[PDB]
Amino acid sequence: IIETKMLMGEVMREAAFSLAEAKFTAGDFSTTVIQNVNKAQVKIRAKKDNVAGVTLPVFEHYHEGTDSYELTGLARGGEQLAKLKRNYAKAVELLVELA
Amino acid sequence: KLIAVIGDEDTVTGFLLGGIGELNKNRHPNFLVVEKDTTINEIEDTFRQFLNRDDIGIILINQYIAEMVRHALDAHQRSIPAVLEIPSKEHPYDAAKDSIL
Amino acid sequence: FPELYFNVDNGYLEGLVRGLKAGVLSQADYLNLVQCETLEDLKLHLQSTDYGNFLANVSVIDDRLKEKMVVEFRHMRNHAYEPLASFLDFITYSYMIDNVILLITGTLHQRSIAELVPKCHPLGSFEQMEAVNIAQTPAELYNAILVDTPLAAFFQDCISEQDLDEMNIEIIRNTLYKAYLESFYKFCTLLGGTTADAMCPILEFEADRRAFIITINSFGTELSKEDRAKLFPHCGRLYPEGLAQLARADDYEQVKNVADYYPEYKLLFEGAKTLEDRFFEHEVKLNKLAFLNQFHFGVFYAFVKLKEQECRNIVWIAECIAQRHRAKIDNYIPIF
């Protein structure tokens, strides 16, 4: 927990730096992305670990179903976006392991 | 079986873009943006709103925002759902929920 | 011949926007803001320039900068008579289009007009034509309200029943921007002379950014090659031939070799600074060139697209300072 809760502090500093690499180029992503969301893309599956005979809850990464911001930007930006996705799909990949 | 996020303005636009948001028009949205003029009660009920929901697995919240609702998350002493404290662009992760030891 | 007039009506406003050109931060002005280390020191150097005493009362730097270029733009539109007041209205249509797609989303999801005032660009705004403020009807009885707005003639490629979720939210912006760029080219062709050779080269490259950035992001998407064909503006240098080969692309190098037929757009594909940082420096190279010609209307549109670069650059300086990541702080656009 100690070695990875400081490690996400660098990743959430690196990925949120890409938010400056982000709408500075392409407008403002503060109303477009918060108005056309219906379903989730990355979900959780509750698996079961075990140590010393004690059942243990563990969360498993599960990305499925569709894209929702597939068409966002696309005329200005869109390369500063969708690497912001990769900076925040890797960040949510680490944060479900820590959860 | 999805992820919830409180975060901030610049936090929630990155994690929705990550693909964790879900709009349930029946119950509630699974996120809550906090601006400069959001009351602490609105963060307080939505923390209880996410805690009472069965499908919420993680509750992401910035510690800079979770510092004022620290008294409510110190009353949550269950295992599921897990509350996580993420750094902001000001005052990163220092002293939250490693204080049990 | 069309130069011994135009000072009857637009004599004073021309010298005004040339005076506001001198308030643009120069190269030496850019260097001292890199040497800053906190946002309070960022406030001190900006008081030395023309912006001064605007932070007397890091995301507040975003709003307090762009609110200054709105009131400077609104003050210019209050004095242009008839040869220019429609021209400044054409610059606001790019902001009205980004506003109205933001509005049909909350209309579709039953999110009312209370979110309109704080979450829209003040340049293209709705503080007149009060029918749009009342409308909560789900996007079919609101299109009948939408035609009491100067974006009506651009909706002639927007069928009202096509709006109801058969078209994607992003697609309707580009085919409205396609209808916008054809009209503003034809309006700038009706005006002749100095405003027809200093402005239309800017609109050709602006239509060719919408040629390249569309097809370079339309690869993994499930929109077919006939969809990205009609989302290209039929305006620029690529019209009869380059628009045809961009439809059959399917690959990053297949949009590069069609840009190799033009020596202007090649040597800009050597970003390999990224591509949009290379398209931006050529765009401000064209807007700076419009400031050479004197007796023409293109000095106003070149001012707004450079004033949005001023509000862009100071924030990028501030974001490298507040997040303390000033190893990429030199990746701004030095316009002057």
Coordinates of C-alpha atoms in Angstrom, one line a residue:
Chain A
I1 CA 0.0 0.0 0.0
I2 CA 2.8 2.4 0.9
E3 CA 4.9 1.9 -2.2
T4 CA 1.9 2.2 -4.6
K5 CA 0.0 5.1 -2.9
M6 CA 3.0 7.3 -3.6
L7 CA 3.3 5.7 -7.1
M8 CA -0.2 6.8 -8.0
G9 CA 0.7 10.3 -6.8
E10 CA 3.1 10.4 -9.7
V11 CA 0.7 8.9 -12.2
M12 CA -2.1 11.2 -11.1
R13 CA 0.5 14.0 -11.6
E14 CA 1.5 12.7 -15.0
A15 CA -2.0 12.1 -16.3
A16 CA -3.3 15.4 -15.0
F17 CA -0.4 17.1 -16.6
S18 CA -1.8 15.7 -19.9
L19 CA -5.0 17.6 -19.0
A20 CA -2.8 20.7 -19.6
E21 CA -1.6 19.0 -22.8
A22 CA -5.4 18.6 -23.4
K23 CA -8.0 21.4 -23.8
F24 CA -5.3 24.1 -24.2
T25 CA -5.1 22.7 -27.7
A26 CA -8.8 21.6 -28.1
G27 CA -11.3 24.0 -26.6
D28 CA -12.7 22.9 -23.2
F29 CA -13.6 19.4 -22.0
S30 CA -15.8 20.4 -19.2
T31 CA -19.3 20.2 -20.7
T32 CA -19.0 17.8 -23.7
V33 CA -17.8 14.8 -21.7
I34 CA -20.2 15.4 -18.8
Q35 CA -23.4 15.4 -21.0
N36 CA -23.4 12.2 -23.3
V37 CA -22.6 9.4 -20.8
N38 CA -25.1 6.6 -20.3
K39 CA -23.2 3.3 -19.6
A40 CA -19.9 2.4 -18.1
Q41 CA -16.8 1.2 -20.1
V42 CA -14.6 -0.1 -17.3
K43 CA -16.3 -2.2 -14.5
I44 CA -15.5 -4.3 -11.5
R45 CA -15.8 -8.0 -10.9
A46 CA -15.7 -9.1 -7.2
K47 CA -13.3 -12.1 -7.1
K48 CA -12.3 -14.1 -4.0
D49 CA -8.8 -14.4 -2.6
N50 CA -7.9 -16.5 0.5
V51 CA -5.3 -16.5 3.2
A52 CA -5.1 -18.6 6.4
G53 CA -8.6 -19.9 5.7
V54 CA -10.1 -16.4 5.7
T55 CA -12.1 -15.4 2.6
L56 CA -10.7 -12.2 1.0
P57 CA -12.5 -9.7 -1.3
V58 CA -10.4 -8.7 -4.3
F59 CA -11.5 -6.4 -7.2
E60 CA -10.8 -7.4 -10.8
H61 CA -10.4 -5.1 -13.8
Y62 CA -13.2 -5.4 -16.4
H63 CA -13.4 -3.2 -19.5
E64 CA -16.3 -4.0 -21.7
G65 CA -19.1 -3.0 -23.9
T66 CA -18.6 0.2 -26.0
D67 CA -16.9 3.5 -26.4
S68 CA -18.7 6.8 -25.5
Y69 CA -16.1 9.5 -26.2
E70 CA -15.0 7.9 -29.5
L71 CA -16.2 11.0 -31.3
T72 CA -14.9 13.8 -29.1
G73 CA -12.8 16.6 -30.5
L74 CA -12.1 15.0 -33.9
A75 CA -11.6 18.3 -35.7
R76 CA -9.4 20.1 -33.2
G77 CA -7.4 17.9 -31.0
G78 CA -8.2 14.3 -30.7
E79 CA -4.5 13.3 -30.3
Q80 CA -4.1 15.2 -27.1
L81 CA -7.3 13.4 -26.3
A82 CA -7.3 9.6 -26.5
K83 CA -3.8 9.6 -25.1
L84 CA -5.4 11.4 -22.2
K85 CA -7.6 8.3 -22.3
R86 CA -4.5 6.1 -22.2
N87 CA -3.1 8.2 -19.4
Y88 CA -6.4 7.6 -17.5
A89 CA -7.1 4.0 -18.6
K90 CA -3.7 3.1 -17.1
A91 CA -4.4 5.2 -14.1
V92 CA -7.7 3.5 -13.5
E93 CA -5.9 0.2 -14.2
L94 CA -3.6 0.9 -11.2
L95 CA -6.3 2.3 -9.0
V96 CA -8.5 -0.8 -9.2
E97 CA -5.6 -2.9 -8.1
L98 CA -5.1 -0.6 -5.1
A99 CA -8.8 -0.8 -4.4
Chain B
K1 CA -20.5 -3.3 -10.2
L2 CA -19.0 0.0 -11.4
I3 CA -16.7 2.7 -10.0
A4 CA -17.8 6.0 -8.5
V5 CA -15.9 9.2 -8.3
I6 CA -16.3 12.5 -6.4
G7 CA -12.9 14.1 -7.2
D8 CA -13.0 17.6 -8.5
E9 CA -13.8 19.4 -11.8
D10 CA -10.5 18.5 -13.4
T11 CA -10.5 15.0 -11.8
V12 CA -14.0 13.9 -12.9
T13 CA -13.4 14.9 -16.6
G14 CA -10.4 12.6 -16.7
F15 CA -12.0 9.6 -15.1
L16 CA -15.2 9.9 -17.1
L17 CA -12.9 9.9 -20.1
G18 CA -11.3 6.9 -18.6
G19 CA -14.6 5.1 -18.9
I20 CA -16.0 4.7 -15.4
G21 CA -19.2 6.9 -15.5
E22 CA -22.7 5.6 -15.7
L23 CA -25.9 7.7 -15.8
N24 CA -28.7 6.0 -13.9
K25 CA -31.8 8.2 -14.5
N26 CA -33.8 6.0 -12.2
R27 CA -31.6 6.3 -9.1
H28 CA -28.8 8.9 -9.5
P29 CA -25.6 9.7 -11.5
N30 CA -22.5 7.8 -10.3
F31 CA -20.3 10.9 -10.1
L32 CA -20.5 14.3 -8.5
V33 CA -18.5 17.3 -9.6
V34 CA -17.6 19.7 -6.8
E35 CA -17.1 23.3 -7.8
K36 CA -15.9 26.2 -5.6
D37 CA -19.5 26.9 -4.5
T38 CA -20.7 23.4 -3.5
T39 CA -21.7 23.0 0.1
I40 CA -20.2 20.3 2.3
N41 CA -23.6 18.9 2.8
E42 CA -23.9 18.1 -0.9
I43 CA -20.6 16.1 -0.6
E44 CA -22.0 14.6 2.6
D45 CA -25.2 13.1 1.3
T46 CA -23.6 11.9 -2.0
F47 CA -21.0 10.1 0.1
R48 CA -23.9 8.4 1.9
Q49 CA -25.7 8.0 -1.5
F50 CA -22.7 6.1 -2.9
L51 CA -22.3 4.1 0.3
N52 CA -25.9 2.9 0.3
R53 CA -25.9 1.9 -3.4
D54 CA -25.2 -1.8 -3.9
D55 CA -23.4 -1.5 -7.3
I56 CA -20.8 0.9 -6.1
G57 CA -17.4 -0.8 -5.6
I58 CA -15.0 2.1 -5.4
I59 CA -15.5 5.7 -4.3
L60 CA -12.8 7.9 -5.7
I61 CA -12.4 11.2 -3.9
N62 CA -9.6 13.8 -3.7
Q63 CA -8.2 14.1 -0.2
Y64 CA -8.3 17.8 -0.6
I65 CA -12.0 17.4 -1.0
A66 CA -12.2 14.4 1.5
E67 CA -10.6 16.5 4.3
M68 CA -13.9 18.2 5.1
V69 CA -15.9 15.0 4.9
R70 CA -13.2 13.2 6.9
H71 CA -15.6 12.7 9.8
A72 CA -18.1 10.8 7.7
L73 CA -15.6 8.5 6.0
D74 CA -14.1 7.8 9.5
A75 CA -17.5 6.4 10.4
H76 CA -17.5 4.1 7.4
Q77 CA -15.6 1.1 8.8
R78 CA -16.9 -1.6 6.4
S79 CA -14.8 -3.4 3.8
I80 CA -17.0 -2.8 0.7
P81 CA -17.1 -0.3 -1.0
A82 CA -13.5 0.8 -0.8
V83 CA -12.9 4.6 -0.4
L84 CA -9.7 5.8 -2.1
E85 CA -7.9 9.1 -1.7
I86 CA -6.3 10.6 -4.8
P87 CA -4.0 13.6 -5.1
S88 CA -5.1 16.9 -6.4
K89 CA -3.0 19.4 -8.2
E90 CA -2.6 21.2 -4.8
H91 CA -1.8 19.3 -1.6
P92 CA -1.3 15.6 -2.6
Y93 CA -1.9 12.4 -0.6
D94 CA -0.4 12.7 2.9
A95 CA -2.4 11.3 5.8
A96 CA -5.6 9.4 4.9
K97 CA -6.6 5.8 5.8
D98 CA -3.2 4.6 6.7
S99 CA -3.9 6.0 10.1
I100 CA -5.5 2.7 11.2
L101 CA -1.9 1.5 12.0
Chain C
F1 CA -10.1 51.5 -56.3
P2 CA -11.7 49.9 -53.2
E3 CA -9.4 51.7 -50.8
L4 CA -10.2 55.4 -51.0
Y5 CA -13.5 54.5 -49.5
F6 CA -13.8 52.2 -46.3
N7 CA -12.5 55.0 -44.2
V8 CA -15.9 56.7 -44.4
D9 CA -17.4 54.0 -42.2
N10 CA -14.5 51.9 -40.8
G11 CA -11.7 54.5 -40.3
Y12 CA -11.8 54.7 -36.6
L13 CA -12.3 51.0 -35.9
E14 CA -9.4 50.0 -38.1
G15 CA -7.0 52.1 -36.1
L16 CA -8.5 50.7 -32.9
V17 CA -7.8 47.1 -33.7
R18 CA -4.3 48.0 -34.8
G19 CA -3.9 49.6 -31.4
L20 CA -5.1 46.4 -29.8
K21 CA -2.5 44.5 -31.8
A22 CA 0.2 46.3 -29.8
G23 CA -1.2 44.9 -26.6
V24 CA -0.2 41.4 -27.7
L25 CA 2.6 40.0 -25.7
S26 CA 5.8 39.9 -27.7
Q27 CA 8.7 37.4 -27.7
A28 CA 10.6 39.3 -25.0
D29 CA 7.4 39.5 -23.0
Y30 CA 7.1 35.7 -23.2
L31 CA 10.6 35.1 -21.8
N32 CA 10.0 36.9 -18.5
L33 CA 6.8 34.8 -17.8
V34 CA 8.9 31.6 -18.1
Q35 CA 11.1 32.9 -15.3
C36 CA 8.1 33.0 -12.9
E37 CA 7.8 30.3 -10.3
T38 CA 4.3 30.9 -8.7
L39 CA 0.9 32.3 -9.7
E40 CA 1.5 35.4 -7.7
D41 CA 4.7 36.2 -9.6
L42 CA 2.6 35.5 -12.8
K43 CA 0.3 38.2 -11.6
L44 CA 3.2 40.7 -11.2
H45 CA 4.6 40.4 -14.7
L46 CA 1.2 40.7 -16.3
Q47 CA 0.7 44.0 -14.5
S48 CA 3.7 45.3 -16.5
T49 CA 1.9 44.6 -19.8
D50 CA -1.4 45.9 -21.1
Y51 CA -3.4 43.4 -19.2
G52 CA -2.6 45.1 -15.9
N53 CA -4.8 45.2 -12.7
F54 CA -7.1 42.5 -14.1
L55 CA -6.5 40.1 -11.2
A56 CA -7.2 42.7 -8.4
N57 CA -10.2 40.7 -7.4
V58 CA -5.1 28.6 -11.6
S59 CA -8.5 28.2 -13.3
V60 CA -9.4 31.8 -12.6
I61 CA -6.6 32.8 -15.0
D62 CA -8.6 30.9 -17.7
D63 CA -11.8 33.0 -17.1
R64 CA -10.4 36.4 -16.3
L65 CA -8.2 36.4 -19.4
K66 CA -11.0 35.3 -21.8
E67 CA -13.5 37.7 -20.4
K68 CA -11.2 40.6 -21.4
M69 CA -11.2 39.5 -25.1
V70 CA -15.0 39.3 -25.0
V71 CA -15.6 42.9 -23.9
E72 CA -12.9 44.0 -26.3
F73 CA -14.7 42.2 -29.1
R74 CA -18.1 43.4 -28.0
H75 CA -16.9 47.0 -28.0
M76 CA -15.8 46.7 -31.7
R77 CA -19.2 45.3 -32.8
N78 CA -21.0 48.3 -31.2
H79 CA -19.6 50.7 -33.8
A80 CA -19.4 48.8 -37.1
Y81 CA -22.2 50.1 -39.3
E82 CA -23.3 47.6 -42.1
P83 CA -20.2 46.5 -44.2
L84 CA -18.6 44.9 -41.1
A85 CA -21.3 44.2 -38.5
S86 CA -22.4 41.2 -40.5
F87 CA -18.7 40.2 -40.8
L88 CA -18.2 40.3 -37.1
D89 CA -21.4 38.2 -36.8
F90 CA -19.7 35.5 -38.9
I91 CA -16.9 35.2 -36.3
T92 CA -19.4 34.6 -33.6
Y93 CA -21.0 31.7 -35.5
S94 CA -18.1 29.4 -34.7
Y95 CA -18.9 30.0 -31.0
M96 CA -22.7 29.8 -31.5
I97 CA -22.2 26.4 -33.1
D98 CA -20.2 25.1 -30.2
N99 CA -22.9 26.5 -27.9
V100 CA -25.9 25.0 -29.6
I101 CA -24.6 21.5 -29.7
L102 CA -24.0 21.9 -25.9
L103 CA -27.6 23.0 -25.7
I104 CA -29.3 20.1 -27.7
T105 CA -27.5 17.6 -25.4
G106 CA -29.2 18.9 -22.3
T107 CA -32.4 19.2 -24.3
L108 CA -32.2 15.6 -25.3
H109 CA -31.4 14.5 -21.7
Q110 CA -34.0 16.9 -20.1
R111 CA -31.4 19.1 -18.5
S112 CA -33.0 22.5 -18.5
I113 CA -31.8 26.0 -19.5
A114 CA -30.4 26.8 -16.0
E115 CA -27.1 25.3 -17.1
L116 CA -26.8 27.7 -20.1
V117 CA -25.5 30.9 -18.5
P118 CA -22.3 29.6 -16.7
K119 CA -21.4 26.9 -19.2
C120 CA -21.2 28.6 -22.6
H121 CA -18.8 30.8 -24.5
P122 CA -19.8 34.5 -24.0
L123 CA -18.7 35.4 -27.6
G124 CA -21.5 33.4 -29.3
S125 CA -24.1 33.9 -26.6
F126 CA -27.9 33.9 -26.3
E127 CA -28.9 37.0 -24.4
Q128 CA -31.3 38.0 -27.2
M129 CA -33.9 35.9 -29.1
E130 CA -35.6 34.9 -25.8
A131 CA -37.5 32.0 -27.4
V132 CA -34.5 29.7 -26.8
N133 CA -34.5 30.4 -23.0
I134 CA -38.0 29.0 -22.5
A135 CA -37.8 25.8 -24.6
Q136 CA -37.5 22.6 -22.7
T137 CA -39.2 20.5 -25.5
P138 CA -37.2 17.4 -26.6
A139 CA -35.4 18.6 -29.7
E140 CA -38.3 18.6 -32.1
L141 CA -40.4 21.5 -31.0
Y142 CA -37.1 23.3 -30.2
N143 CA -35.8 23.2 -33.7
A144 CA -38.9 25.3 -34.7
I145 CA -37.7 27.7 -32.0
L146 CA -34.1 27.3 -33.2
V147 CA -34.8 29.0 -36.5
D148 CA -35.2 32.3 -34.8
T149 CA -31.4 32.5 -34.6
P150 CA -28.8 33.4 -37.3
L151 CA -27.8 29.8 -37.4
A152 CA -31.0 29.0 -39.4
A153 CA -29.4 29.0 -42.8
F154 CA -26.8 26.5 -41.7
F155 CA -29.5 24.1 -40.6
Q156 CA -30.6 23.5 -44.2
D157 CA -28.4 20.3 -44.2
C158 CA -29.9 19.4 -40.8
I159 CA -33.2 17.6 -41.1
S160 CA -35.2 18.0 -37.9
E161 CA -36.1 14.3 -37.6
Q162 CA -32.5 13.4 -38.3
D163 CA -31.5 15.2 -35.0
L164 CA -33.2 12.6 -32.8
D165 CA -30.3 10.3 -32.0
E166 CA -29.8 9.0 -35.6
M167 CA -26.8 11.4 -35.9
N168 CA -24.0 11.4 -33.4
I169 CA -23.5 14.5 -31.2
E170 CA -20.0 15.2 -32.7
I171 CA -21.1 14.6 -36.4
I172 CA -23.7 17.4 -36.3
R173 CA -21.0 19.9 -35.3
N174 CA -18.8 19.2 -38.3
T175 CA -21.6 19.2 -40.9
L176 CA -22.7 22.5 -39.4
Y177 CA -19.1 23.8 -39.5
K178 CA -19.1 22.5 -43.1
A179 CA -22.2 24.7 -43.8
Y180 CA -20.5 27.5 -41.9
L181 CA -17.2 27.5 -43.9
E182 CA -18.9 27.5 -47.3
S183 CA -21.0 30.5 -46.5
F184 CA -18.2 32.5 -44.9
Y185 CA -16.0 31.9 -47.9
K186 CA -18.8 32.9 -50.3
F187 CA -19.5 36.0 -48.1
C188 CA -15.8 36.9 -48.3
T189 CA -15.9 36.4 -52.0
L190 CA -18.8 38.8 -52.4
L191 CA -16.5 41.4 -50.8
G192 CA -13.6 42.0 -53.2
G193 CA -10.1 43.4 -53.3
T194 CA -7.9 43.4 -50.2
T195 CA -10.3 41.4 -48.0
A196 CA -10.5 38.7 -50.7
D197 CA -6.8 37.8 -50.8
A198 CA -5.8 38.3 -47.2
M199 CA -8.7 36.4 -45.7
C200 CA -9.4 33.6 -48.1
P201 CA -5.9 32.1 -47.7
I202 CA -6.7 31.8 -44.0
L203 CA -10.0 30.1 -44.8
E204 CA -8.3 27.7 -47.2
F205 CA -5.9 26.4 -44.6
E206 CA -8.7 26.4 -42.0
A207 CA -10.7 24.1 -44.2
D208 CA -7.7 21.9 -44.8
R209 CA -7.1 21.4 -41.1
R210 CA -10.7 20.2 -41.2
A211 CA -9.6 18.0 -44.1
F212 CA -6.7 16.4 -42.2
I213 CA -7.8 16.3 -38.5
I214 CA -11.1 14.6 -39.5
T215 CA -9.5 11.7 -41.5
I216 CA -6.6 11.2 -39.0
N217 CA -9.1 10.5 -36.1
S218 CA -11.7 8.7 -38.3
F219 CA -9.7 5.4 -38.4
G220 CA -10.8 3.3 -35.4
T221 CA -14.3 4.9 -35.5
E222 CA -17.3 3.2 -37.1
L223 CA -18.1 6.0 -39.5
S224 CA -17.8 5.0 -43.1
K225 CA -15.8 6.6 -45.9
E226 CA -18.9 8.3 -47.2
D227 CA -19.5 10.0 -43.9
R228 CA -16.1 11.6 -43.6
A229 CA -16.4 12.7 -47.3
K230 CA -19.4 14.9 -46.6
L231 CA -17.8 16.2 -43.3
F232 CA -15.0 17.7 -45.4
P233 CA -15.5 21.4 -46.2
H234 CA -15.5 21.8 -50.0
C235 CA -13.5 25.0 -49.6
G236 CA -9.7 24.8 -49.7
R237 CA -6.9 23.8 -51.9
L238 CA -7.7 20.1 -51.6
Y239 CA -11.2 20.4 -53.1
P240 CA -11.3 18.5 -56.5
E241 CA -8.6 15.9 -55.8
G242 CA -7.4 15.9 -52.2
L243 CA -10.8 15.4 -50.8
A244 CA -11.2 12.2 -52.9
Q245 CA -8.0 10.5 -51.8
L246 CA -8.6 11.3 -48.2
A247 CA -11.8 9.2 -48.2
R248 CA -9.9 6.0 -49.2
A249 CA -7.1 6.6 -46.7
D250 CA -7.4 4.0 -43.9
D251 CA -3.8 4.7 -42.8
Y252 CA -1.6 7.4 -41.3
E253 CA 0.9 7.3 -44.2
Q254 CA -2.0 7.4 -46.7
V255 CA -2.9 10.8 -45.5
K256 CA 0.7 11.9 -45.6
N257 CA 1.4 11.2 -49.2
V258 CA -1.7 13.1 -50.3
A259 CA -0.3 16.0 -48.3
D260 CA 3.0 15.5 -50.2
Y261 CA 1.3 16.8 -53.3
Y262 CA 1.3 20.3 -51.7
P263 CA 4.6 21.8 -50.5
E264 CA 2.8 23.9 -48.0
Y265 CA 1.2 21.0 -46.1
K266 CA 4.2 18.8 -46.4
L267 CA 7.1 20.1 -44.1
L268 CA 4.2 20.5 -41.7
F269 CA 3.9 16.7 -41.5
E270 CA 7.4 16.6 -40.0
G271 CA 6.1 17.0 -36.5
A272 CA 6.6 13.2 -36.3
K273 CA 6.0 19.4 -31.4
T274 CA 3.1 17.3 -32.6
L275 CA 0.9 17.8 -35.7
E276 CA -1.6 20.2 -34.1
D277 CA 1.3 22.2 -32.7
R278 CA 2.6 22.4 -36.2
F279 CA -0.8 23.4 -37.7
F280 CA -1.1 26.1 -35.0
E281 CA 2.2 27.8 -35.9
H282 CA 1.3 27.9 -39.5
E283 CA -2.2 29.3 -38.6
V284 CA -0.6 32.2 -36.6
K285 CA 1.8 32.7 -39.5
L286 CA -1.2 33.4 -41.7
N287 CA -3.0 35.6 -39.2
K288 CA 0.2 37.6 -38.8
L289 CA 0.4 38.0 -42.6
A290 CA -3.2 39.4 -42.6
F291 CA -1.9 42.3 -40.5
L292 CA 0.3 43.4 -43.4
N293 CA -2.6 44.5 -45.6
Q294 CA -4.3 47.6 -44.4
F295 CA -7.6 48.5 -46.1
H296 CA -9.5 45.3 -45.5
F297 CA -11.8 43.5 -43.1
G298 CA -9.5 40.6 -42.4
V299 CA -7.6 42.5 -39.7
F300 CA -10.5 41.7 -37.2
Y301 CA -10.7 38.0 -37.7
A302 CA -6.9 37.8 -37.5
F303 CA -7.1 39.6 -34.2
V304 CA -9.6 37.2 -32.6
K305 CA -7.7 34.1 -33.6
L306 CA -4.5 35.6 -32.2
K307 CA -6.3 36.8 -29.0
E308 CA -7.4 33.3 -28.3
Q309 CA -3.8 32.3 -28.7
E310 CA -2.9 34.9 -26.0
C311 CA -5.3 33.4 -23.5
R312 CA -4.1 29.9 -24.5
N313 CA -0.4 30.6 -24.0
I314 CA -0.6 32.3 -20.6
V315 CA -2.6 29.4 -19.2
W316 CA 0.0 26.9 -20.5
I317 CA 2.7 29.0 -18.8
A318 CA 0.5 28.9 -15.6
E319 CA -0.2 25.2 -15.9
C320 CA 3.6 24.4 -16.1
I321 CA 4.1 26.7 -13.1
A322 CA 1.3 25.6 -10.8
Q323 CA 1.8 21.9 -11.5
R324 CA 5.6 22.5 -11.3
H325 CA 6.4 20.7 -14.6
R326 CA 8.3 23.4 -16.5
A327 CA 10.4 21.2 -18.6
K328 CA 7.8 21.5 -21.4
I329 CA 7.1 25.1 -20.7
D330 CA 8.8 26.2 -23.9
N331 CA 6.1 24.4 -26.0
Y332 CA 3.9 27.5 -26.5
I333 CA 3.3 29.5 -29.7
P334 CA 5.3 32.7 -29.9
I335 CA 3.0 34.7 -32.2
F336 CA 4.8 38.0 -32.0

